[PDB]
Amino acid sequence: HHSGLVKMSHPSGDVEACMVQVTCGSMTLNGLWLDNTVWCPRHVMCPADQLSDPNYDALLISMTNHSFSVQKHANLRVVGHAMQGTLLKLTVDVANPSTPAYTFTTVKPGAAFSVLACYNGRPTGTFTVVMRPNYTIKGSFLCGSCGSVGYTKEGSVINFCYMHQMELANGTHTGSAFDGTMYGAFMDKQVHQVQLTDKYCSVNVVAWLYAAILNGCAWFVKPNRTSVVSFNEWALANQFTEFVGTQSVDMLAVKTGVAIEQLLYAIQQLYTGFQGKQILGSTMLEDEFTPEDVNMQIMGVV
Amino acid sequence: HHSGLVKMSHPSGDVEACMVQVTCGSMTLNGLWLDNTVWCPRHVMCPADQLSDPNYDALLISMTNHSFSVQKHANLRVVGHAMQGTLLKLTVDVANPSTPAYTFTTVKPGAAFSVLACYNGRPTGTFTVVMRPNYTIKGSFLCGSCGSVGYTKEGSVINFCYMHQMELANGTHTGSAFDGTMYGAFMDKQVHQVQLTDKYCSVNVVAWLYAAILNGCAWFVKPNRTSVVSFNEWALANQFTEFVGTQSVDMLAVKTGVAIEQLLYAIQQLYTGFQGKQILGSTMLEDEFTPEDVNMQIMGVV
C-alpha cells in the first residue's frame, strides 16, 4: 500500500521570477532580486587564489558599484553595495516588478523547506530538504549553484530562509540566512571544517509512524508508553533529538487515536531493530517528513 | 557520505501559468490552458450518482458550451467542446498569453516526470515520480486534484505526458496521456480494477548502483558478470523489468570504469540480501532514480 507521501515542494514560479545572475571579477553565481535589492553570497568577490582565507572586508572596500554585473535572463545597474554577514546587498536602479509578498526567517532543525537550484541565474530544478540537527541539508548542488534559495510559503507570502554557500566534505550542504549568518558554526571559507553529529529528528519519526497508522500499518503500536521526559533522556544517549510536541502532532494523535507516548516507546524498540518487518516499505526509521507534511498530504489539512 | 541525489522536479512556473479551474454541473477540477484549448478529465461531466458507470458519450451530447465554466485565478468563455478518449478539449475565446513551447508525449515505465498538484485551479505543490511498470505512479493526490499535470522538459519545450484521473485501491495513482488514452489497462470509472504487478526497474537500479560508485561506495562490485541476455531471463522470474541499456547508462560505465554486466550480477546477489551492509544509506534496492538523474545531479551532464 502506497503511503501517499512524496517529497513535495512549493510551486516555484514566484521565486523563479526573482532570480538573477551576479558576476564580480572572475566569479559568477546567482542572486535574489526583491524590490530594489539583489542578495548574493559575498564570495562572488573572491578571487580563486583566495577562497580558503578571503579577507572579505578588504575585498568589499576594493569594489565599486560598477564591479558588480547583474543580469536577468535585462541588465540591472548597481547603485549601492553593502555586506551583511556572509551576504552582499546590492542596490539596483530597477525594482523587480514581480516581487512577491515576502519575509525573511530562519529555519529550525527538522523543518522542511523548498529549494530552487539555479545556475547562471537560470532555475534548473526544485526539491525539498529538512534542515538537519547539525545545520546541514542533504541537497543536490554543483559548481555555480551558490545563491540558490530556500523558502517556505504561508498563504501568498514567501518566507526566504536559505541562500546556498557550500558543500561539506561528507557531501552535505549549508548556507546563510538572510540576516547574513551561516547556519550552524560554519564559515564561508574553502577549508575543512568540523561537522557536528547528525541526529534522528524525533518529531519527524513520530510523524512518519502516524503516517503509517493512517495507511493501515500499525503492527508496531502497543499499549506500552514512554513519557516525553523519559524519551528525551534516552534520546540524548542514542543520537536522537529531544522531542517537542506540537499542535500538528496532536492532530495526528486525535485522528488516529494513538498517543504520542505509544510511538515514543515504539521508536525505542524499533531503533534496536525492525526484526525483518517493514513500515511503509522501509526497514529503517524515516525522519524526512514533518508532522505538517503528513497532515497536509494525507489529511488535506493546511 | 551524502549521495548528492534528491528527488528533483522541473521549475514549475511555466506550467503554473497554464492551470485553470473547470466546473461542469456539480463537479470542479483542474484544466490545462494552451493556446485556445483547455484540456481536462471528462469525468467533470459526471454526476456523483454515476461515477461508477458513466455514459460519457451521452453526457457529452447533453452538454452545451455554456455548461462549462472555466476560470483562471479571469473567466474564459467556452466556444467549443469535444471529447478525446478520457479527456475533454474545450475551445476558449482567449489564447493563453503565457503558453510555453510545448509538445505532448507518452512517458514509459521507469521514466521520471514532474507533477504540478493543483486544487481548484490553484497550484499547491510539485513532486517527481517514475512511471511504474504497472502504469501507476506513487504520487500524492487528494480529492479535487484531477486535471493536475505531469511533464518533462527538453530545453525550453515542455513535454506534457500526464493528466491526473484517479487513485487505485492500493493508494497509487494513474491518469491519461494527452492523446486521451489512460496509462495501462485502466478505465476512468469509479470501480475496483485489476492491478498488474509492479516490478523493480532494472535500468534505474543500475543507475543507483553507479551513483553509489560515484560516491565512493563500491563494496558490491566484483569481477563477476552477468550478461544482459542472462539477466533478462532471470528478471522475468524475479519481478524485475528486462534491462535495456542506453547512452546515459554507458556514460556512467565510462566514468566509473565498471561494466553494466558487473552491476547486473551485483543486482542478482543483492536481491537475495544485502547481508547487513548498506548502499547509499539503504538496505534495499532503489529504482526511483534514472540514469539521466544520476548523470545530471552528480556529473552535471544534461
Ligand SMILES: *C(=O)[C@H](C[C@@H]1CCNC1=O)NC(=O)[C@H](CC(C)C)NC(=O)OC[C@@H]1C[C@H]1CCC
Ligand atoms: C558555490 O557555487 C559553491 C557551491 C558548492 C560547489 C560544489 N557543490 C556545492 O554546493 N560553493 C563553494 O564552492 C564553496 C566556496 C567557499 C568560499 C564558501 N566551497 C566549497 O563548497 O567546497 C567544497 C569541498 C568539499 C569541501 C572541502 C573543503 C572546503
Ligand SMILES: *C(=O)[C@H](C[C@@H]1CCNC1=O)NC(=O)[C@H](CC(C)C)NC(=O)OC[C@@H]1C[C@H]1CCC
Ligand atoms: C479527481 O480529483 C479524483 C482524484 C483522486 C481522489 C482521491 N485521490 C485521487 O487521486 N478522482 C477520482 O475520485 C476518481 C473518479 C473516477 C470517475 C475516475 N475515483 C477514484 O479515484 O476513486 C478512488 C478509490 C480507491 C478507489 C476504489 C474504486 C475505484
